[PDB]
Scaffold this motif. Structure first.
Motif, short mmCIF file in Angstrom:
data_model
loop_
_atom_site.label_atom_id
_atom_site.label_comp_id
_atom_site.label_asym_id
_atom_site.label_seq_id
_atom_site.Cartn_x
_atom_site.Cartn_y
_atom_site.Cartn_z
N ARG D 10 1.05 -0.85 0.09
CA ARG D 10 -0.26 0.16 -0.62
C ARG D 10 1.13 1.22 0.00
O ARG D 10 0.34 2.36 -0.94
CB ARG D 10 -0.93 -0.48 0.99
CG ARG D 10 -1.82 -1.54 1.52
CD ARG D 10 -3.32 -0.38 1.70
NE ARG D 10 -4.37 -1.17 1.77
CZ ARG D 10 -5.03 -2.25 3.08
NH1 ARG D 10 -3.88 -2.18 4.06
NH2 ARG D 10 -5.90 -2.73 2.70
N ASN D 11 1.82 0.94 0.86
CA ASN D 11 3.18 2.25 1.11
C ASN D 11 3.58 2.51 -1.00
O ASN D 11 3.87 4.10 -1.19
CB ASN D 11 3.42 1.99 2.07
CG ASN D 11 4.47 3.49 1.60
OD1 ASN D 11 6.16 3.78 2.29
ND2 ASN D 11 3.66 5.02 2.66
N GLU F 49 9.70 8.43 1.83
CA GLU F 49 8.85 7.46 1.57
C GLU F 49 7.84 7.27 2.91
O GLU F 49 6.83 7.23 3.04
CB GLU F 49 9.31 6.59 2.07
CG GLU F 49 10.35 5.41 0.71
CD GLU F 49 11.09 4.02 1.27
OE1 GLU F 49 10.94 4.01 2.29
OE2 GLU F 49 11.60 4.00 0.34
N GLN F 52 5.32 10.24 2.14
CA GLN F 52 3.63 9.10 0.69
C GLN F 52 3.38 8.39 2.32
O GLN F 52 2.02 8.49 1.75
CB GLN F 52 4.70 7.68 0.08
CG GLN F 52 5.72 8.95 -0.86
CD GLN F 52 6.31 7.30 -1.97
OE1 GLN F 52 7.64 7.53 -2.72
NE2 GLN F 52 6.24 6.11 -1.67
N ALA F 53 3.45 8.01 3.37
CA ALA F 53 2.78 7.08 3.73
C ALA F 53 2.51 8.20 4.50
O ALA F 53 0.89 8.37 5.20
CB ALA F 53 3.51 6.74 5.33
N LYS F 56 -0.41 9.52 2.28
CA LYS F 56 -1.26 8.41 1.36
C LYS F 56 -2.64 8.27 0.93
O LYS F 56 -3.43 7.91 -0.19
CB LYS F 56 -0.94 6.32 2.06
CG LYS F 56 -1.75 5.53 1.02
CD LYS F 56 -1.38 5.86 -0.07
CE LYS F 56 1.06 5.70 -0.19
NZ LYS F 56 0.84 5.86 -1.68
#
Ligand SMILES: [Mg+2]
Ligand SMILES: [Mg+2]
Ligand SMILES: [Mg+2]
Ligand SMILES: [Mg+2]
Ligand SMILES: [Mg+2]
Ligand SMILES: [Mg+2]
Ligand SMILES: [Mg+2]
Ligand SMILES: [Mg+2]
Ligand SMILES: [Mg+2]
Ligand SMILES: [Mg+2]
Ligand SMILES: [Zn+2]
Lengths: 106, 62, 131, 100, 50, 107
Positions: D10-11, F49, F52-53, F56
């Motif tokens: 999902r990430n 990242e 992004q988390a 999301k």
RNA sequence: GUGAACAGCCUCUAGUUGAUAGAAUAAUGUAGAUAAGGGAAGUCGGCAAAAUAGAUCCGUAACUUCGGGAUAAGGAUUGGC
RNA sequence: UUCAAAUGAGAACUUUGAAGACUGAAGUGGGGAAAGGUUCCACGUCAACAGCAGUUGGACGUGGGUUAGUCGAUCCUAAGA
């Protein structure tokens, strides 16, 4: 009608680099190829064999190279090799497993 | 560096929009050297510039 | 809270309750009194064409026929099929007047049940014949 | 482990706004390859041998250009207007010396 | 307009060739009082009026 | 000093009442303040990242709890105004619930 | 795609991500909402809001230049499988 | 709107990558007519201007670029002159 078609897969590069098992791959194909919408229905229709470097599938019942690539990609994803090994066609109905491009560490 | 010209040239050369063109962020000097469509084609060939796939509009639910 | 719920289930816009409709449907005399009414201008259709289950007056016989041949009436009938859920049910659920609730349950199962079902069947066949 | 794989996928994935870059066009590193294959539990001898052969083949030998021009630059005066050799400079062509 | 007359194009060519700052050697001349181009034209400031 | 730890940040109580267009940017700033409090470093860098988390589920769909890995390391550049900085990475876990702060051995 | 639909809403190709920002969340505003019981008692004046609304079926008055009025009025229904 | 890197003395605003959104084919897409006249593109580049900023620009400096028997004008006539 029911002219038999032969599909070949060359597993030599991953096998010789020691990240692949051709017998497990062929058993997976035998267990997961569908005929008339069901697995386990390969009665005198689909035959899968392997000799350590080439996996051969002989089929008379609705088997395509796209289906073979789909099943091989499923197997590679299950073995967590999808990020490194891909399935390509050399000529028509002759395929091979290759590695993706890797630059040396040095 | 300013890679606006290279992004535009790569879009025109590959034949997609600028939204579908990927310039390698590590090869910044190599991209900056490319003033011509011939050099852009060479970069596309060696993989510094990559064409992205289309965004899916699936018809399964339809 | 919201506008739909408030303007539908306001206190002054209330409709007849399920246990009251069950008591109206239980006996044949109540069915007769509800079917045969004097002509009253304050009710739609002069008090005629009254669905007992929905507790609702329709303007015409064709309107009542269309209402009966519909899912809303079927939903109301399925709601009325069960136990009328008096306060004794909640008391028994809390563990209170359990013997009284059991007596009411066995009376519903024995006496009031089949007679109400027969009254419903006779009302349905009367409506089918007269419509 | 299955829940962790779901969370990691999902990430990683952003399929609603754009597509995933193709692995046939991307390239990866042997360090990441070796750590992933070690996590899987295979034998890294053949892969390490191939990487060592590739690294020993990729040789850099100093050339004459490295010897002479390696630490230098320029060799030619930079023009004020960023012009080429045979390009006219309307602003400054009448003033020959840089002091003036 | 893209499809323009030759007369309009000729006046445009003259305007383009006039569009420049002063040559720098002009400033070095004896008793020079010309210090900037007082008749400089830009496309977004003063229109040519045909 | 160089050290790496795993934390859980409760973003729910920190984003309680925030305007929907500002939720994810305020989550970024809350993570920066959280790292500054826990590592004493004004220089805090978030991994893309981790970004992004955070983002999301859109601009207003931030998670209630996030599992972060925070590494206080050395600023190797000789023009650094501070000698240490924090680096914040996501820890993609099965669930962010019921996790305590732990120390990661840096090997 | 939904839908009668070049409507509204969501998406693909392509194109943008521009318009000074940050931190708080007093009053008063601008724009948008909800509200017990009563229901125009408010006000010069129901101003403004609210209520209605698509489609199918039943049914539809006075008047009339006989063409209309008319979607008059008033009722019933609508999902999924 | 956000993250990292690069560039730079200096980065909320430049570039690339990583994300989140939007226009939603009656477009924030692709071309033209009138009009404008080089604004197009490259290199250099920041004093002034871009109501904050600026390393960016339709800004400043220096240059490059518009190729026709077949596309138009040119020919015909309209209201008219
Ligand atoms: Mg609030
Ligand atoms: Mg009220
Ligand atoms: Mg009054
Ligand atoms: Mg009064
Ligand atoms: Mg009327
Ligand atoms: Mg949209
Ligand atoms: Mg054009
Ligand atoms: Mg330009
Ligand atoms: Mg300013
Ligand atoms: Mg210029
Ligand atoms: Zn009914």
């Amino acid at each position: 009608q029911k002219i038999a078609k032969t599909f070949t897969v060359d597993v030599s590069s991953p096998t010789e680099n020691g990240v692949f098992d051709p017998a497990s791959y062929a058993k997976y194909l035998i267990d997961h190829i569908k005929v008339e919408g069901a697995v386990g229905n390969l009665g005198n229709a689909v035959t899968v064999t392997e000799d350590g470097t080439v996996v051969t599938v002989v089929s008379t019942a609705k088997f395509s190279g796209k289906y073979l690539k789909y099943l091989t990609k499923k197997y590679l994803k299950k073995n967590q090799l999808r990020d490194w090994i891909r399935f390509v066609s050399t000529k028509t109905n002759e395929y091979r497993l290759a590695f993706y491009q890797v630059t040396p560490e040095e | 560096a300013n890679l606006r010209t290279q992004k535009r040239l790569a879009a025109s050369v590959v034949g997609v929009g600028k939204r579908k063109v990927w310039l390698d962020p590590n090869e910044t000097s190599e991209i900056a050297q490319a003033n011509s469509r011939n050099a852009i084609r060479k970069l596309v060939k060696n993989g510094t510039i990559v064409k992205k796939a289309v965004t899916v509009h699936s018809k399964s639910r339809t | 809270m919201g506008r739909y719920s408030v303007k539908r289930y306001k206190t002054k816009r209330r409709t007849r309750d399920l246990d009251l409709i069950y008591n109206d449907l239980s006996t044949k005399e109540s069915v007769q009194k509800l079917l045969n009414q004097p002509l009253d201008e304050t009710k739609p259709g002069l008090g005629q064409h009254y669905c007992i289950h929905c507790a609702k007056y329709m303007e015409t016989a064709i309107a009542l026929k269309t209402h009966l041949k519909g899912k809303v009436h079927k939903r109301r009938v399925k709601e009325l099929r069960g136990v009328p859920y008096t306060q004794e049910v909640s008391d028994a659920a809390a563990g209170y007047n359990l013997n009284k609730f059991l007596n009411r349950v066995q009376e519903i199962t024995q006496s009031v049940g089949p007679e109400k079902e027969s009254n419903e069947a006779l009302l349905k066949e009367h409506l089918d014949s007269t419509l | 482990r299955q829940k962790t794989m779901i969370a990691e996928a999902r990430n990683r994935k952003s399929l609603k706004n754009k597509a995933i870059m193709p692995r046939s066009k991307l390239t990866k590193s042997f360090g990441k390859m070796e750590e992933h294959m070690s996590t899987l539990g295979h034998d890294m001898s053949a892969l390490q041998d191939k990487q060592n052969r590739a690294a020993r083949k990729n040789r850099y030998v100093e050339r004459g250009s490295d010897v002479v021009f390696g630490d230098q630059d320029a060799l030619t005066a930079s023009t004020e207007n960023g012009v080429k050799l045979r390009q006219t400079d309307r602003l400054l062509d009448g003033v020959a010396d840089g002091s003036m | 307009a893209a499809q323009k007359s030759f007369r309009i194009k000729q006046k445009m060519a003259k305007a383009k060739k006039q569009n420049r700052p002063l040559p720098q050697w002009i400033r070095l001349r004896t008793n020079n009082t010309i210090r900037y181009n007082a008749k400089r034209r830009n496309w977004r400031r003063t229109k040519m009026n045909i | 000093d160089v050290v790496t730890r795993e934390y859980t940040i409760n973003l729910h109580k920190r984003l309680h009442g925030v305007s929907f267009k500002k939720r994810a940017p305020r989550a970024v700033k809350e993570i920066k303040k959280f790292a500054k409090l826990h590592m004493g470093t004004d220089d805090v860098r978030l991994a893309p990242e981790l970004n992004q988390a955070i983002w999301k589920r859109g601009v207003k769909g931030v998670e209630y709890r996030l599992r972060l890995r925070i590494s206080r390391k050395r600023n190797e550049e000789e023009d650094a105004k501070n000698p240490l900085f924090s680096y914040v990475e996501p820890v993609l876990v099965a669930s962010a619930k019921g996790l305590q702060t732990v120390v990661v051995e840096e090997d």
